[PDB]
Design a protein around this ligand. Structure first.
Ligand code: SAH
Length: 201
């Protein structure tokens, strides 16, 4: 299931493969939100096909309507919005991404990353190609770098297919570069700690 403007339509595996054809890389943003972050990534790199996934189609309507417009009007040819959840990812996305990101998650997705939920993370790892980079950027209260650096957390992620190569604590200034309304709120509000766990799959 993908969005064509405000309408939900079916995209087959063969159709997806055809679209991917004009691009050298594929990036998946899980729990993409309002689509503004992915829109910015896509506008700055036309050799990567961007796939934004979120179970809430309603919040993607504005940007979904924008990408279908003509190029001169803000339209993009390297973005697709998939309506799905981490617990039930589309089989068409298996082994397709060069990179996967989960940015400023909330709700169940945040817990799957922080706990972490090994089975769910395993499903997310299945979306990656043999290669593949990953990036999880989280924040809770306005846990800690130590937690994400612990052997237990590293082992749990490794079991799911994620090999941590770096853990960095980021600040509000860093988040000011993102365009989603949510990211702006997090960046402009009280001082908050953000953590990026990144590596390869
Ligand atoms: N289990 C799950 N699977 C997929 N997406 C989920 C999810 N649980 C929560 N989400 C999505 O995670 C988002 C958290 S808020 C917005 C995050 C976005 N990445 C940004 O920076 O703007 C919401 O849009 C919500 O629908």
């Amino acid at each position: 299931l993908i969005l064509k403007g405000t309408k939900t339509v079916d995209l087959s595996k063969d159709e997806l493969t055809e679209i991917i054809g004009q691009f050298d890389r594929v990036h998946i943003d899980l729990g993409t939100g309002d689509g503004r972050n992915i829109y910015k990534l896509a506008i700055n790199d036309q050799n990567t096909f961007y796939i934004g996934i979120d179970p809430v189609k309603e919040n993607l309507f504005d940007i979904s309507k924008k990408i279908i417009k003509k190029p001169s009007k803000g339209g993009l040819s390297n973005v697709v919005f998939v309506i799905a959840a981490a617990e039930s990812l589309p089989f068409e996305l298996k082994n397709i991404a060069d990179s996967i990101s989960i940015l400023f998650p909330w709700g169940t997705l945040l817990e799957y990353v922080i706990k972490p939920n090994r089975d769910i993370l395993s499903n997310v790892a299945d979306l990656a190609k043999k290669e593949a980079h990953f990036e999880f950027v989280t924040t809770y209260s306005d846990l800690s770098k130590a937690y994400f650096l612990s052997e237990q957390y590293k082992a749990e992620l490794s079991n799911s297919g994620f090999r941590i190569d770096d853990v960095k604590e980021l600040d509000n200034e860093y988040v000011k570069q993102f365009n989603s309304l949510w990211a702006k709120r997090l960046a402009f509000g009280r001082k908050r700690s953000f953590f990026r766990v990144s590596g390869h799959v």
